Protein backbone atom coordinates (compact mmCIF):
# COMPACT_ATOMS: atom_id res chain seq x y z
CA UNK A 1 0.00 0.00 0.00
CA UNK A 2 1.44 3.40 -1.15
CA UNK A 3 2.31 6.31 1.12
CA UNK A 4 -1.18 7.59 1.98
CA UNK A 5 -0.56 11.34 1.88
CA UNK A 6 1.35 11.11 -1.40
CA UNK A 7 -1.38 8.83 -2.88
CA UNK A 8 -4.23 11.28 -1.93
CA UNK A 9 -2.47 14.18 -3.63
CA UNK A 10 -1.63 12.08 -6.76
CA UNK A 11 -5.24 10.92 -6.92
CA UNK A 12 -6.49 14.53 -6.65
CA UNK A 13 -4.10 15.60 -9.42
CA UNK A 14 -5.32 12.65 -11.54
CA UNK A 15 -8.88 14.00 -11.38
CA UNK A 16 -7.80 17.49 -12.27
CA UNK A 17 -5.42 16.37 -15.06
CA UNK A 18 -6.95 13.12 -16.42
CA UNK A 19 -5.08 13.59 -19.73
CA UNK A 20 -1.68 13.93 -18.06
CA UNK A 21 -1.42 10.67 -16.09
CA UNK A 22 2.41 10.66 -16.06
CA UNK A 23 3.83 14.19 -15.65
CA UNK A 24 7.49 15.01 -15.35
CA UNK A 25 8.66 15.43 -11.76
CA UNK A 26 11.70 17.09 -10.27
CA UNK A 27 12.75 14.41 -7.78
CA UNK A 28 15.19 14.80 -4.90
CA UNK A 29 18.07 12.30 -4.66
CA UNK A 30 18.88 12.39 -0.93
CA UNK A 31 15.41 12.79 0.67
CA UNK A 32 14.95 15.29 3.47
CA UNK A 33 14.01 12.46 5.84
CA UNK A 34 17.41 10.87 5.15
CA UNK A 35 19.24 14.07 5.99
CA UNK A 36 19.02 16.01 2.69
CA UNK A 37 18.53 19.80 2.75
CA UNK A 38 15.64 19.92 0.21
CA UNK A 39 12.33 19.46 2.10
CA UNK A 40 10.28 18.61 -1.03
CA UNK A 41 10.57 15.00 -2.15
CA UNK A 42 8.93 15.74 -5.56
CA UNK A 43 7.58 18.63 -7.66
CA UNK A 44 5.14 17.69 -10.40
CA UNK A 45 5.00 19.86 -13.53
CA UNK A 46 1.91 20.08 -15.73
CA UNK A 47 0.98 21.93 -18.90
CA UNK A 48 -2.25 23.88 -18.69
CA UNK A 49 -3.58 24.88 -22.16
CA UNK A 50 -5.65 27.78 -20.77
CA UNK A 51 -9.31 28.79 -20.57
CA UNK A 52 -10.66 31.67 -22.67
CA UNK A 53 -13.72 32.55 -20.54
CA UNK A 54 -11.75 32.62 -17.27
CA UNK A 55 -8.85 34.61 -18.72
CA UNK A 56 -6.41 31.78 -18.08
CA UNK A 57 -3.41 31.89 -20.44
CA UNK A 58 -1.38 28.78 -21.30
CA UNK A 59 1.06 28.08 -18.51
CA UNK A 60 3.15 25.63 -16.54
CA UNK A 61 1.63 24.40 -13.22
CA UNK A 62 3.99 23.23 -10.46
CA UNK A 63 2.86 21.21 -7.35
CA UNK A 64 5.13 20.31 -4.38
CA UNK A 65 5.14 17.17 -2.24
CA UNK A 66 6.70 17.29 1.20
CA UNK A 67 5.24 20.20 3.25
CA UNK A 68 2.24 17.98 4.00
CA UNK A 69 2.55 14.54 5.63
CA UNK A 70 3.20 12.24 2.64
CA UNK A 71 3.97 9.15 4.71
CA UNK A 72 2.11 9.10 8.01
CA UNK A 73 5.04 7.60 9.97
CA UNK A 74 6.70 10.75 11.43
CA UNK A 75 9.80 10.48 9.23
CA UNK A 76 9.44 14.26 8.70
CA UNK A 77 6.25 15.42 10.44
CA UNK A 78 5.50 14.69 14.05
CA UNK A 79 1.89 13.71 14.63
CA UNK A 80 0.15 15.50 17.48
CA UNK A 81 -3.10 14.25 18.98
CA UNK A 82 -5.96 16.55 18.02
CA UNK A 83 -4.18 18.20 15.08
CA UNK A 84 -6.28 18.04 11.88
CA UNK A 85 -3.57 19.28 9.42
CA UNK A 86 -1.36 16.97 7.33
CA UNK A 87 2.23 18.01 8.27
CA UNK A 88 2.36 21.78 7.81
CA UNK A 89 -1.16 21.48 6.34
CA UNK A 90 -0.41 22.70 2.84
CA UNK A 91 1.61 22.20 -0.36
CA UNK A 92 2.96 24.87 -2.65
CA UNK A 93 1.74 25.50 -6.20
CA UNK A 94 2.93 27.96 -8.86
CA UNK A 95 1.54 28.99 -12.27
CA UNK A 96 4.09 30.22 -14.75
CA UNK A 97 3.14 31.99 -18.03
CA UNK A 98 4.72 30.57 -21.16
CA UNK A 99 7.02 33.07 -22.77
CA UNK A 100 6.57 34.39 -26.35
CA UNK A 101 9.50 32.18 -27.38
CA UNK A 102 7.84 29.08 -25.82
CA UNK A 103 4.48 29.92 -27.42
CA UNK A 104 5.88 29.96 -30.96
CA UNK A 105 7.27 26.40 -30.58
CA UNK A 106 4.34 24.10 -29.49
CA UNK A 107 1.92 24.92 -32.33
CA UNK A 108 4.18 24.88 -35.44
CA UNK A 109 7.68 23.66 -34.33
CA UNK A 110 7.75 19.87 -34.53
CA UNK A 111 9.29 16.78 -32.93
CA UNK A 112 9.04 16.37 -29.18
CA UNK A 113 6.88 17.87 -26.41
CA UNK A 114 8.36 21.16 -25.01
CA UNK A 115 9.90 20.70 -21.50
CA UNK A 116 8.62 22.97 -18.66
CA UNK A 117 11.24 25.25 -17.07
CA UNK A 118 12.64 23.61 -13.95
CA UNK A 119 13.82 26.76 -12.18
CA UNK A 120 10.52 27.00 -10.22
CA UNK A 121 11.52 23.77 -8.41
CA UNK A 122 14.42 25.67 -6.72
CA UNK A 123 12.01 28.42 -5.82
CA UNK A 124 9.58 25.97 -4.16
CA UNK A 125 12.43 24.14 -2.35
CA UNK A 126 13.67 27.48 -1.00
CA UNK A 127 10.16 28.52 0.13
CA UNK A 128 9.80 25.04 1.64
CA UNK A 129 13.05 25.55 3.63
CA UNK A 130 11.88 28.95 4.79
CA UNK A 131 8.64 27.39 6.17
CA UNK A 132 10.49 24.48 7.88
CA UNK A 133 13.12 26.73 9.40
CA UNK A 134 10.77 29.37 10.76
CA UNK A 135 7.84 27.02 11.56
CA UNK A 136 5.27 29.42 10.04
CA UNK A 137 2.87 27.80 7.54
CA UNK A 138 1.35 29.92 4.76
CA UNK A 139 -2.25 31.14 4.60
CA UNK A 140 -4.28 32.66 1.74
CA UNK A 141 -3.61 36.39 1.62
CA UNK A 142 -0.08 36.11 3.13
CA UNK A 143 2.90 37.81 1.55
CA UNK A 144 6.50 36.65 1.43
CA UNK A 145 9.04 39.51 1.21
CA UNK A 146 11.45 37.37 -0.85
CA UNK A 147 13.35 40.41 -2.12
CA UNK A 148 14.89 38.74 -5.19
CA UNK A 149 13.81 37.71 -8.67
CA UNK A 150 11.97 34.41 -8.50
CA UNK A 151 13.95 33.03 -11.44
CA UNK A 152 17.31 34.51 -10.40
CA UNK A 153 17.27 36.82 -13.46
CA UNK A 154 18.59 40.41 -13.26
CA UNK A 155 15.65 41.79 -15.29
CA UNK A 156 12.38 40.45 -13.84
CA UNK A 157 10.41 42.96 -11.74
CA UNK A 158 8.83 39.99 -9.87
CA UNK A 159 10.88 39.79 -6.58
CA UNK A 160 8.24 38.98 -3.97
CA UNK A 161 5.33 36.65 -3.46
CA UNK A 162 1.70 36.64 -2.38
CA UNK A 163 -0.17 33.49 -1.37
CA UNK A 164 -3.52 32.57 -2.94
CA UNK A 165 -5.71 29.50 -2.84
CA UNK A 166 -5.00 27.35 -5.91
CA UNK A 167 -8.19 27.83 -8.03
CA UNK A 168 -8.10 24.25 -9.45
CA UNK A 169 -6.76 22.30 -6.52
CA UNK A 170 -8.43 24.07 -3.60
CA UNK A 171 -8.14 22.25 -0.28
CA UNK A 172 -8.54 18.51 0.32
CA UNK A 173 -8.79 15.98 3.13
CA UNK A 174 -6.38 13.04 3.05
CA UNK A 175 -5.72 9.95 5.16
CA UNK A 176 -2.94 11.95 6.89
CA UNK A 177 -4.92 15.18 7.37
CA UNK A 178 -6.01 18.29 5.52
CA UNK A 179 -3.86 19.79 2.71
CA UNK A 180 -4.53 23.33 1.42
CA UNK A 181 -2.93 24.09 -1.98
CA UNK A 182 -1.19 27.43 -1.46
CA UNK A 183 -0.49 29.04 -4.81
CA UNK A 184 2.48 31.35 -4.86
CA UNK A 185 2.03 34.51 -7.03
CA UNK A 186 4.96 36.71 -8.09
CA UNK A 187 4.35 40.42 -7.49
CA UNK A 188 5.93 43.90 -7.90
CA UNK A 189 7.43 45.84 -5.04
CA UNK A 190 4.39 48.15 -4.84
CA UNK A 191 1.99 45.17 -4.90
CA UNK A 192 3.94 43.63 -2.00
CA UNK A 193 3.96 46.96 -0.18
CA UNK A 194 0.16 47.27 -0.39
CA UNK A 195 -0.55 43.63 0.49
CA UNK A 196 1.59 44.24 3.60
CA UNK A 197 0.24 47.65 4.63
CA UNK A 198 -3.36 47.17 3.45
CA UNK A 199 -4.38 43.60 2.56
CA UNK A 200 -3.09 40.65 0.56
CA UNK A 201 -6.47 39.29 -0.50
CA UNK A 202 -7.53 42.74 -1.75
CA UNK A 203 -4.33 42.98 -3.87
CA UNK A 204 -4.89 39.42 -5.24
CA UNK A 205 -8.44 40.44 -6.11
CA UNK A 206 -7.06 43.40 -8.11
CA UNK A 207 -4.63 41.10 -9.98
CA UNK A 208 -7.40 38.66 -10.94
CA UNK A 209 -9.35 41.35 -12.80
CA UNK A 210 -7.28 41.46 -15.97
CA UNK A 211 -5.29 38.98 -18.05
CA UNK A 212 -2.31 41.39 -18.05
CA UNK A 213 -1.94 40.93 -14.26
CA UNK A 214 -2.56 37.15 -14.09
CA UNK A 215 -6.25 36.63 -14.98
CA UNK A 216 -8.70 34.59 -12.88
CA UNK A 217 -6.10 32.00 -11.86
CA UNK A 218 -3.30 34.40 -10.92
CA UNK A 219 -0.71 33.16 -13.39
CA UNK A 220 2.73 34.69 -12.84
CA UNK A 221 4.34 36.29 -15.93
CA UNK A 222 8.06 36.96 -15.21
CA UNK A 223 8.19 39.47 -18.09
CA UNK A 224 5.35 41.62 -16.69
CA UNK A 225 6.28 45.27 -17.13
CA UNK A 226 3.79 47.24 -15.04
CA UNK A 227 2.11 46.71 -11.66
CA UNK A 228 -1.62 46.60 -11.20
CA UNK A 229 -1.50 50.08 -9.66
CA UNK A 230 0.32 51.40 -12.78
CA UNK A 231 -2.11 49.66 -15.17
CA UNK A 232 -5.27 50.51 -13.23
CA UNK A 233 -4.56 53.59 -11.08
CA UNK A 234 -8.14 53.47 -9.77
CA UNK A 235 -7.02 50.64 -7.46
CA UNK A 236 -4.92 53.20 -5.51
CA UNK A 237 -8.10 54.66 -3.99
CA UNK A 238 -8.41 51.65 -1.66
CA UNK A 239 -4.98 52.35 -0.12
CA UNK A 240 -5.58 55.67 1.67
CA UNK A 241 -5.27 55.79 5.48
CA UNK A 242 -8.48 57.17 6.89
CA UNK A 243 -8.44 59.71 9.66
CA UNK A 244 -10.56 59.86 11.96
Amino acid sequence: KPPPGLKAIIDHLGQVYPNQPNPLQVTTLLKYWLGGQDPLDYISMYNYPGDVDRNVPPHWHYISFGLSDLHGDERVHLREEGVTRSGMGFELTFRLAKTEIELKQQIENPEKPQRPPTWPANLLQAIGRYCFQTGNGLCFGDNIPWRKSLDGSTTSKLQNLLVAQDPQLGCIDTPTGTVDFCQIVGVFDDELEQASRWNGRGVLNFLRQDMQTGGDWLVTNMDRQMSVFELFPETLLNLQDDLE
Partner: peptide
Protein backbone atom coordinates in the same frame (compact mmCIF):
# COMPACT_ATOMS: atom_id res chain seq x y z
CA UNK B 1 47.37 20.25 -23.08
CA UNK B 2 44.27 20.44 -20.92
CA UNK B 3 41.16 19.10 -22.71
CA UNK B 4 38.11 17.91 -20.81
CA UNK B 5 35.32 15.56 -21.70
CA UNK B 6 35.21 15.30 -17.90
CA UNK B 7 31.79 16.38 -17.04
CA UNK B 8 30.53 16.27 -13.49
CA UNK B 9 27.70 17.44 -13.00
CA UNK B 10 24.71 19.12 -11.20
CA UNK B 11 21.38 17.92 -12.18
CA UNK B 12 18.45 20.38 -12.14
CA UNK B 13 18.71 24.16 -12.33
CA UNK B 14 21.91 24.32 -10.23
CA UNK B 15 20.81 21.83 -7.59
CA UNK B 16 22.95 18.70 -7.56
CA UNK B 17 20.46 16.94 -5.24
CA UNK B 18 17.70 16.88 -7.90
CA UNK B 19 16.94 14.86 -11.03
CA UNK B 20 14.28 15.08 -13.74
CA UNK B 21 12.13 12.00 -14.16
CA UNK B 22 8.55 10.87 -14.83
CA UNK B 23 6.08 10.31 -12.05
CA UNK B 24 5.84 6.59 -12.87
CA UNK B 25 9.64 6.27 -12.29
CA UNK B 26 8.95 7.23 -8.70
CA UNK B 27 5.76 5.08 -8.21
CA UNK B 28 3.65 2.19 -9.50
Amino acid sequence: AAPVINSHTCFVSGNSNMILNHMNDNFA
